[PDB]
């Protein structure tokens, strides 16, 4: 089906042309605009008071990455090396090494924030939910260097936002 959008039939009776002349002479349609915006002013605004109040978000939010650890506290990461293999920007660099215990985890988990694109594929890639990416978005900076996150930086951030992301995946893993 379809419908026309500009087939207009201006009736040429003496009545109708009076409105058309009234429209042109007295700026009726322009006055419609004035009363239109006036009604908008007489309405409330919707400007949220940042940072005293921020935008509404969702448990599935993708933000800043943070490596987590088990309830025991050992790092979930086992260097399966899936995340960099799917990482569409190759922002994840990592090299595994033997460990003293034999639970040979990685000596390197460096995610370049200025190369990464926050698809969240790393979360889906990780079979042990080691690399998740938290709800934080305030991690701005002034020098390009501090965005080259390293294994220590992710571990510290994971220990920081651990209170938040733990509940987020708690309320979202059923969907995943």
């Amino acid at each position: 089906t379809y419908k026309f959008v500009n087939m207009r039939e201006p009736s040429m009776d003496m009545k109708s042309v009076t409105d058309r002349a009234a429209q042109t002479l007295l700026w009726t349609e322009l006055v419609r605009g004035l009363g239109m915006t006036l009604s908008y002013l007489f309405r409330e605004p919707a400007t949220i008071n940042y940072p005293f109040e921020k935008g509404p978000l969702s448990p599935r939010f993708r933000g800043e990455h943070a490596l987590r650890r088990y309830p025991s506290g050992e790092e979930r990461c086992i260097a399966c090396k899936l995340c960099e293999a799917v990482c569409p920007a190759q922002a994840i660099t990592i090299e595994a090494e033997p460990r003293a215990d034999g639970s040979r985890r990685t000596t390197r988990y460096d995610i370049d924030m200025t190369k990464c694109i926050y698809c969240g594929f790393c979360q889906e890639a990780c079979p042990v939910d080691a690399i998740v990416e938290g709800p934080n978005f305030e991690f701005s900076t002034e020098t390009h260097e501090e965005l080259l996150y390293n294994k220590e930086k992710l571990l510290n951030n994971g220990d920081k936002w651990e209170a938040e992301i733990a509940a987020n995946i708690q309320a979202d893993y059923l969907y995943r």
Binding site: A46, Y50, K54, T114, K115, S140, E142, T143, H144, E146
Partner: protein, 155 residues
Amino acid sequence: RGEYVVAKLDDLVNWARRSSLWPMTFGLACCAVEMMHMAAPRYDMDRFGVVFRASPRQSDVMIVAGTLTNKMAPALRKVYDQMPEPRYVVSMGSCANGGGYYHYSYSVVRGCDRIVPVDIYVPGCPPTAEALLYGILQLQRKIKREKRLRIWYRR
């Protein structure tokens, strides 16, 4: 003494400079529409005291927002050049930060800082509107911690 007087004078200039900057968003890519989104009534930069001003001879801070290519490279620098002092550039998004998703392609310079002296790096792909709003807030905090008149006093 003179230190106290110059401290007040520096603060007086400081307060306006951190509350009257007029950004010029050099709209490049999907990062740019987000900056128009934080022009929406939801965030409304202008409530802070900043207005989207063209003619970059009027603007104070200029925002690269999106990927930057070699074709865009020389003109973008010139925008920075005749941009009057004080001038600050904020890196919007991963692509402007460090090339981002196209960091390896043949046509985009990896990172915008290779062309201009980036002041604030804002991560994101795209950075959510209020994340940039946070970055602008960081700009004023950094603007608050300057010693222009103080340095001249010891100069």
